[PDB]
Design a protein around this ligand. Structure first.
Ligand SMILES: [Cl-]
Ligand SMILES: [Cl-]
Ligand SMILES: [Cl-]
Ligand SMILES: [Cl-]
Ligand SMILES: [Zn+2]
Ligand SMILES: [Zn+2]
Lengths: 273, 281
């Protein structure tokens, strides 16, 4: 180490995207609208499977724990343009390692707009535990068969990556391997994870989720949702798996007033050319 | 009594918080690179080329399987945003997410840059890191991150308004287009989440927010790689400079070295991942 190592290490952090820089969603408006809302549908995702669901702009979707503790891997697309999809990396940069009430799931470049806003999180109490763990992560990618093959050999077909691929292909009619390339880094719903403080390694731990817990979103745009009930179960392994319930709710007409769906990002896309 | 709300803490909150961490991908699970072989081959090697990346610009460089590329600090402290492609198949490119899962928030000597699904193989292995002494500082900061995405004009427009054309996303896009002859917006869709070379960053301990801090890099420092497959690299000298703002920018130097004949012995260039790709169908 150089002689000024201590000074270098002591230089203070600057948050990259401070909270006061972010646009503020109208959570009050969304909540009042949700109080007005009626259930319009549901999808039960069986253990170790994926299912797609559709949600219109201005509607709500809830993911609930049922039967036993189980984590879900969520993907989102613009219903009318599958290439616009959830961007966990910018969501992470804007909000942090994990997401909760008042935060947004952002779309990929060049679209970069809010796709959904979290309006309730029954595990919102969790915070950051003594190990650096929190729930609803935007730091993993998704369990996948390629990694499985790399590390253990073999071919396992019910990793979240495959579950999402099949669900997407079935819902859209896309060829399986075309649907595969639109599957993206997930929101790890109910998963309790972090980075070790001593080595910076990605860790998991038994999820604090219990039946009855839920995470609820306001759809900012028309969405195709895609959810996998992870074969890791509650991720307590050193797995017993359960379904996940998706419910859709629609507010009474007029309750959102003049609220407009967010527009796609306005950057001129010239890149200096 | 007082009534409970859906999000209120349960009586066993602290018990649930006390449940111990389990590392998702333990290091003993990973294939071990033959770092000694790579290093012996590097000590034999001769320089074959260099690319000087100007400040606020991107440049591509090509490296063959079995060769080495070094990114060096020159003139003053400056971070670099790296992208990698299979030279012969630009769709296969660096996957910061799985690299992060397998190695951690930041990378160093002996760790690999892994490609995207369905290819998932080592693209490059880090063989020297002159900042390896840094470790993890008192704030959770380390160098060479695989947790950011890249500074980009869309986020700029979102947060500040306006149109700024020398963010790393744009610099990588022009560089890739210019090297490959791809149309600009086609090249753009192949740009990917970066390796943040020399950048000192982490997540805050109290809120889990992404932070940066002045880089500990100084002229002379470098990060050196062994190319596992034929690569098209793409490196942007970030307009953040040393990312010490609460920017003075400098070039970055990429140099390529080729080992003496026979020096890689029986090392095989990794093949694409072996999963059957059926997904059960
Ligand atoms: Cl096998
Ligand atoms: Cl089971
Ligand atoms: Cl970023
Ligand atoms: Cl403007
Ligand atoms: Zn999974
Ligand atoms: Zn940058």
């Amino acid at each position: 180490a150089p002689l000024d190592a201590d000074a270098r290490r002591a230089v203070k952090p600057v948050i990259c995207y401070p909270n006061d820089s972010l646009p503020r969603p109208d959570l009050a408006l969304y909540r009042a609208a949700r109080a007005s809302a009626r259930k319009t549908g549901e999808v039960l995702v069986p253990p170790r499977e994926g299912r797609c669901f559709e949600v219109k702009a201005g509607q709500f979707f809830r993911i609930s724990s049922v039967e036993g503790p189980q984590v879900g891997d969520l993907n989102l697309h613009n219903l009318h343009d599958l290439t616009e999809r959830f961007f966990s990396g910018k969501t992470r940069a804007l909000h942090g390692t994990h997401v909760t009430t008042g935060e947004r799931l952002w779309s990929n470049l060049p679209y970069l707009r809010p796709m959904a806003t979290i309006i309730e999180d029954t595990l919102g109490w969790y915070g950051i535990d003594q190990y650096g763990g929190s729930v609803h992560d935007v730091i993993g990618t998704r369990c996948d068969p390629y990694t499985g093959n790399l590390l253990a050999g073999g071919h396992y077909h019910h990793c979240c990556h495959s579950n999402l691929t099949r669900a997407l292909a079935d819902h859209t009619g896309l060829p399986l391997h075309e649907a595969e390339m639109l599957v993206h880094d997930v929101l790890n719903v109910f998963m309790c994870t972090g980075f070790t403080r001593d080595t910076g390694q990605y860790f998991m731990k038994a999820s604090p989720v219990r039946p009855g817990d839920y995470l609820e979103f306001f759809a900012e745009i028309d969405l195709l949702g895609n959810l996998s009930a992870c074969p890791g179960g509650d991720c307590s392994s050193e797995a017993s798996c359960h379904p996940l319930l998706v419910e859709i709710f629609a507010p009474a007409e007029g309750m959102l007033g003049d609220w407009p769906s967010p527009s796609v990002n306005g950057y001129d896309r010239s890149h200096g050319r």
